[PDB]
Amino acid sequence: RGEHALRRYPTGEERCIACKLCEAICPAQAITIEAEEREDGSRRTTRYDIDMTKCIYCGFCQEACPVDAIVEGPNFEFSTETREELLYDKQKLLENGDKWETEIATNLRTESLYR
Amino acid sequence: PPSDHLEVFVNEQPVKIPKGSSVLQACDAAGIDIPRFCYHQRLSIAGNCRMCLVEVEKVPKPVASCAMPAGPGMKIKTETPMVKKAREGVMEFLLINHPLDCPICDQGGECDLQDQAMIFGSDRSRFVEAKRAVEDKNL
Amino acid sequence: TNSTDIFNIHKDTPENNAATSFEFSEATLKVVNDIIARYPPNYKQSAIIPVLDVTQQENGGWLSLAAMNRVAKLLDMAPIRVYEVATFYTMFNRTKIGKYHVQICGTTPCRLQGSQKIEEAITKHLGIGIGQTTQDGLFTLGEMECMGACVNAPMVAIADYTKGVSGFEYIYYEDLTPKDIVNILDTIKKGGKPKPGSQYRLKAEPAGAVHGGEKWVPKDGETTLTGAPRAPYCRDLNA
Amino acid sequence: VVPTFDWKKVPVPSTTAKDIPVTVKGATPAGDLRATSGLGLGDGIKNHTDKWLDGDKKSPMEYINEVAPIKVKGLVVASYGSDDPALGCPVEYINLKGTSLENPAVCKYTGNRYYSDDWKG
Amino acid sequence: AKTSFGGLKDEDRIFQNIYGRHDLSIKGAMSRGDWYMTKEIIGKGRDWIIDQMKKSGLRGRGGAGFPSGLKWSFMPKASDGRPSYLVVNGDESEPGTCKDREIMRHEPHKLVEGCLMAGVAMGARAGYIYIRGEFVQERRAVERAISEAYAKGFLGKNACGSGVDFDLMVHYGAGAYICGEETALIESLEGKQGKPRLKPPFPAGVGLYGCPTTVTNVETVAVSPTILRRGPEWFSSFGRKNNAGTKLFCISGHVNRPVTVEEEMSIPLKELIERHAGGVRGGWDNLLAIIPGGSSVPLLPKKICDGVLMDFDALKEAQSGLGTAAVIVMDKSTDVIDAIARLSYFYKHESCGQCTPCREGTGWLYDIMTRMKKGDARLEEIDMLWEITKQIEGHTICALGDAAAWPVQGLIRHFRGEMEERIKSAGGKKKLAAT
Amino acid sequence: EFATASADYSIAMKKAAEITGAAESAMGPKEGGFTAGVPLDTFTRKARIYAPARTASQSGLARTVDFATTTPAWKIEFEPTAKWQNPLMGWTSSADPLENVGRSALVFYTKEEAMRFCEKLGWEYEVTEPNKRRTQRTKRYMQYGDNFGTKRAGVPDLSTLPSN
Numbered sequence A: 001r002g003e004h005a006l007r008r009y010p011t012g013e014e015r016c017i018a019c020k021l022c023e024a025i026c027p028a029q030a031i032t033i034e035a036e037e038r039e040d041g042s043r044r045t046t047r048y049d050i051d052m053t054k055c056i057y058c059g060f061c062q063e064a065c066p067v068d069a070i071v072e073g074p075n076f077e078f079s080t081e082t083r084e085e086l087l088y089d090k091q092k093l094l095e096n097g098d099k100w101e102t103e104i105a106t107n108l109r110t111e112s113l114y115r
Numbered sequence B: 001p002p003s004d005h006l007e008v009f010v011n012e013q014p015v016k017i018p019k020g021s022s023v024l025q026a027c028d029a030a031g032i033d034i035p036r037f038c039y040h041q042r043l044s045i046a047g048n049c050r051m052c053l054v055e056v057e058k059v060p061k062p063v064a065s066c067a068m069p070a071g072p073g074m075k076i077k078t079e080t081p082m083v084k085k086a087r088e089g090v091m092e093f094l095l096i097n098h099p100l101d102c103p104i105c106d107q108g109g110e111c112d113l114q115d116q117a118m119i120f121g122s123d124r125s126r127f128v129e130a131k132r133a134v135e136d137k138n139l
Numbered sequence C: 001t002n003s004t005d006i007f008n009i010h011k012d013t014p015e016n017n018a019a020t021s022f023e024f025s026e027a028t029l030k031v032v033n034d035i036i037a038r039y040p041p042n043y044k045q046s047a048i049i050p051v052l053d054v055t056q057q058e059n060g061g062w063l064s065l066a067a068m069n070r071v072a073k074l075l076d077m078a079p080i081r082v083y084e085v086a087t088f089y090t091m092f093n094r095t096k097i098g099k100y101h102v103q104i105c106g107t108t109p110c111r112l113q114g115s116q117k118i119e120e121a122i123t124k125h126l127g128i129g130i131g132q133t134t135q136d137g138l139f140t141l142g143e144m145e146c147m148g149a150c151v152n153a154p155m156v157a158i159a160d161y162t163k164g165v166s167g168f169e170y171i172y173y174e175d176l177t178p179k180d181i182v183n184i185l186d187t188i189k190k191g192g193k194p195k196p197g198s199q200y201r202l203k204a205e206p207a208g209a210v211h212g213g214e215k216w217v218p219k220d221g222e223t224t225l226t227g228a229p230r231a232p233y234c235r236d237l238n239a
Numbered sequence D: 001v002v003p004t005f006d007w008k009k010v011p012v013p014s015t016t017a018k019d020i021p022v023t024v025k026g027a028t029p030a031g032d033l034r035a036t037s038g039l040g041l042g043d044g045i046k047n048h049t050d051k052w053l054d055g056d057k058k059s060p061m062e063y064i065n066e067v068a069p070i071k072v073k074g075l076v077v078a079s080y081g082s083d084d085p086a087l088g089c090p091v092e093y094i095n096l097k098g099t100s101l102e103n104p105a106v107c108k109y110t111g112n113r114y115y116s117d118d119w120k121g
Numbered sequence E: 001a002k003t004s005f006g007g008l009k010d011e012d013r014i015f016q017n018i019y020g021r022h023d024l025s026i027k028g029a030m031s032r033g034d035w036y037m038t039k040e041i042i043g044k045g046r047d048w049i050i051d052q053m054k055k056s057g058l059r060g061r062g063g064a065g066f067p068s069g070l071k072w073s074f075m076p077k078a079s080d081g082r083p084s085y086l087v088v089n090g091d092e093s094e095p096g097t098c099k100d101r102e103i104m105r106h107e108p109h110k111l112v113e114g115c116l117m118a119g120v121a122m123g124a125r126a127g128y129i130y131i132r133g134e135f136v137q138e139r140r141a142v143e144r145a146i147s148e149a150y151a152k153g154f155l156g157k158n159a160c161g162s163g164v165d166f167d168l169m170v171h172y173g174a175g176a177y178i179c180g181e182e183t184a185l186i187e188s189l190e191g192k193q194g195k196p197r198l199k200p201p202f203p204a205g206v207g208l209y210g211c212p213t214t215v216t217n218v219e220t221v222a223v224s225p226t227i228l229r230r231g232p233e234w235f236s237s238f239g240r241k242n243n244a245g246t247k248l249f250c251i252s253g254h255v256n257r258p259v260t261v262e263e264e265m266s267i268p269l270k271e272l273i274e275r276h277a278g279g280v281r282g283g284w285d286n287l288l289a290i291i292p293g294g295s296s297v298p299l300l301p302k303k304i305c306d307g308v309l310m311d312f313d314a315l316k317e318a319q320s321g322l323g324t325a326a327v328i329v330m331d332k333s334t335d336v337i338d339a340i341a342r343l344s345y346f347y348k349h350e351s352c353g354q355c356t357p358c359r360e361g362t363g364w365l366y367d368i369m370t371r372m373k374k375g376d377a378r379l380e381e382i383d384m385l386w387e388i389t390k391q392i393e394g395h396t397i398c399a400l401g402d403a404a405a406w407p408v409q410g411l412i413r414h415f416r417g418e419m420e421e422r423i424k425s426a427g428g429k430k431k432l433a434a435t
Numbered sequence F: 001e002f003a004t005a006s007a008d009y010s011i012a013m014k015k016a017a018e019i020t021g022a023a024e025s026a027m028g029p030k031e032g033g034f035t036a037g038v039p040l041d042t043f044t045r046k047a048r049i050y051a052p053a054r055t056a057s058q059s060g061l062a063r064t065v066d067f068a069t070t071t072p073a074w075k076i077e078f079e080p081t082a083k084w085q086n087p088l089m090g091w092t093s094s095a096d097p098l099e100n101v102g103r104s105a106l107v108f109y110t111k112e113e114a115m116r117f118c119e120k121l122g123w124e125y126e127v128t129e130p131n132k133r134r135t136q137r138t139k140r141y142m143q144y145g146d147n148f149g150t151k152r153a154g155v156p157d158l159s160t161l162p163s164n
């Protein structure tokens, strides 16, 4: 359970559908979500924040997600010099997922036999 | 008045109700809240969801409590094995064609179907066939 | 629900839209007004199913949106009730069909007698499956449930829409083989009248049977009501 | 008796009428009411994607619009979003009758589009 | 008391022209005894006709079997402000059943006189006949008989010169099997979809147009004038106790001579099939199963059939029912799972969709049966199938849900070994690809 | 016979509330706030004593005053104070210490219990009695049999019959 990340389908569409289950289960209340409907009618988020200085790195959000959108990736080396660099918004989490997608998929090909 | 309030028995407890009341209203006056999907207080009675099924003495079938009138000296049972089996079966029939839509549905969190499935239904399904799909409507 | 009607909602077509016109003729309006008089005036809505049937022969074998709206205005009821009735019942076609509507029974008493081979013969001859119309607009193939002719299984019903309301014919053809239904279809196509009822006996009287769906095999045995009919009689109602 | 009401003579303020959030074709009729919340109103942002994406970066909606609809034989299709059903979305059963390449049916989970040439058309 | 039943004489058959051999006009019917002494029977009284119908032991020929004399007596005896209605059920959409077609096509004057007798017996001012919409020529023949009965003054004001008023009308449906149910028939006759009402209320209390109403079968109505003329003691001399009278039987399927034939009740199946129908195709030892009462009752195997009487209180103890007495015969070449699967398809197709268990579970039963036909199932799915039928049955608004559960119950009960062998041997063609 | 939730631990909670000597404990007005040790300006705020109505989205009645003797349903609520947005992230900021304490933690069986708590703590209170549900249905559609009655269009006139 490392740095949180947001994932896509192979087409390039976001997996997240703003169900707010990960926000409800979070014991630290480290997630803040706002949503409305997109211009094509889809149900998508407009804000998805994770306070990494409030997070406890439990993985409960990863368990609660029904579409495998939020994960905790294999990155542990993400120390910064300012605390404002650790208040992640939606764009940075998507950038993390776009960085770590192949490793996350390799990990999930094994861990889907157990979960 | 010729006894305008009649006495029924809900789980061996005597309950006085006004005349013309149904079995469901007698259960409500006894402090029991019967599961329902098609009954409404402000609408006419339909009787089509089959969720309000209770047991009445000397009746071999479950009765629909929303529509069945309450007679004098009637004995209503709401917690026998046939009532619980009826509730689980009717819930299972309600859920076989329903879409797996709770993450994208707006009723999630305040849904009668979800909460009644959690309380009066089972925890599993045995259905592996294809579901019914319906196009949406513009209103 | 039947064949040929996969939608329970209205689909716009150049033939079928809200701009399309329907109106009764004089004789059909006489028929419809005679139907309405069978029922109380404050319960005039009871007449919807026969009126919709008469409208279906008038329009040519199917109900359009304009026909349903005309029937709704005629019986002074909301159109959604008319749409409910028209979509609920199996005989009401809501898309355009051919001139003759061929309907085959597929329920188990007809199925044991070989209705599947009759369906195979019809599809091999006419070249269409269930739910389809021929390219000439002559025949429409459909499937039905039990038609109440099970002792003369396997059977086909054929509906005639080429003469309008006055010459509407709904004819049962019973005790069939592939040759019998091929001959009936050829007789209809050539302009003749094929013989109604059973092809090897008169009625539901005891005679042979279709063996395997391919050959009639006659069989002799005991037959009742072969003598003279009974005389009138009554007991003494006094005591 | 009971005269008809003329809705076309009803006045609407021009500031309100020009600010209605509507939709492109997608999963609705084009031009129906689009639900919005208050986020971005102080910064004058009326668009869904601009509320969280900054720059000329390729949006997720522009990614899914480049994938063509998929021809499926039958009347109903099951959508998982993956080859492996464990790795995708909960299964979505999408109606395919009345659908074509021009007016396909869309999955509410994945945004993939499907149509069928099997409904006698 | 007689012990052996069957071999009914031609002089005791009620329907003397069930084959349409004789003249079908009103002169042929009046010369054959119909419309005879009708004014004298009506002048006896309402209570007299009720008592005479009670003493006959005639039960409902629609499929349930309720006593007709007590049923007709449920109608009110005085005036409150509403008229009363007779409605006669001529739907006959039960698979296998084709007796009412013959009664409506070849003996309609018996039906019309019985409508008059029943309407007088129940205080009804008007009457409706609900004929099947597929029965077009039968409707035309019934309307011809009604026009003829009006032209001689038998129907209308001062009917048969008796002082009682009765009118008869013809309604027809448009192809729904569920419209054979009573309250569904009333709902379709009122100008709506054929969806049954919940009981209570009962049609004799609140029926058509909110008025007292009795729905009765064509065959129940038609035998009443012959019973009133020839006596209740004559009618009750046939069949066992509480099982009185004669019955039309329709024999279809794998039979050498399929037939609609009238016979005494409590006749054995083997007697009823070997005589009057030429026996089972290929001999009696080629029999596999028989449905004795249409389609809504469970099937019976060869061991039960050899010995059982075609009777109300005899098929019920054999875990079946008499129903409409429509007999469907299958032989040893029949895939009985495929036959009951097509029956499941019928009940899926004919569900009206009003209530949850029927509407959702008939399709589920059909899907499970379709998988069972190919053997693509598990052995415990048979017990699941029994559980699902027990979940539908007794839990719905009307009796089509029970009628959908019952054939699958009979198939499981009498041929579970066939279903298990179908599952086991399918893996001889499915597990050769897994390895 | 007596059976009012007689199969759970709530029997052992109703008694232990009526133990002698402890069932008659009482304090003067505002005295419990002096010994509570929280700042005294907190008791200058106003409180509302009320039982919340059933949500419109659902039909169940468990969180209402219908089950008042079974479940505590009366609440204490306070008026809102200022909220604003965080400049860096946009999160909702507040300076209210009583922002969720009445809605999460304080529940009472009756109205008088909540009043007693407010009186001993020093909060000034207003009490709102909930609106009572009506169970009697309309004259039309009173029973299921009134759907099919003669009140739809009156008694049918028999003047379109043959022979009139």
Ligand SMILES: Cc1cc2nc3c(=O)[nH]c(=O)nc-3n(C[C@H](O)[C@H](O)[C@H](O)COP(=O)(O)O)c2cc1C
Pocket: E059, E060, E061, E062, E063, E064, E065, E066, E068, E089, E090, E091, E092, E093, E094, E177, E178, E179, E180, E181, E182, E215, E216, E217, E218, E220, E398, E399, E400, E403
């Ligand atoms: C699904 C269903 C279909 C029925 N179809 C018929 C029918 O076609 N003809 C009939 O007489 N009764 C039919 N019935 C039975 C009627 O509801 C009713 O009990 C019967 O017609 C009363 O006639 P009786 O005089 O024989 O008692 C059907 C019942 C059900 C549940």
Ligand code: SF4
Pocket: A004, A025, A026, A027, A028, A029, A030, A031, A050, A054, A055, A056, A057, A058, A059, A060, A061, A062, A072
């Ligand atoms: S890992 Fe735990 S703390 Fe971090 S976002 Fe998920 S639930 Fe919250």
Ligand code: SF4
Pocket: A015, A016, A017, A018, A019, A020, A021, A022, A023, A033, A064, A065, A066, A067, A068, A069, A070
């Ligand atoms: S990340 Fe998953 S759980 Fe969280 S809102 Fe999006 S879809 Fe729901």
Ligand code: SF4
Pocket: E178, E195, E196, E350, E351, E352, E353, E354, E355, E356, E358, E359, E396, E397, E398, E399, E400, E401
């Ligand atoms: S059992 Fe079937 S036919 Fe009868 S009311 Fe229910 S859904 Fe309709």
Ligand code: FES
Pocket: B035, B036, B037, B038, B039, B046, B047, B048, B049, B050, B051, B052, B064, B065, B066, B067
């Ligand atoms: S509440 Fe639906 S059947 Fe009674």
Ligand code: FES
Pocket: C105, C106, C107, C108, C109, C110, C111, C145, C146, C147, C148, C149, C150, C153, C155, E095, E096, E097
């Ligand atoms: S099964 Fe074909 S007519 Fe009945």
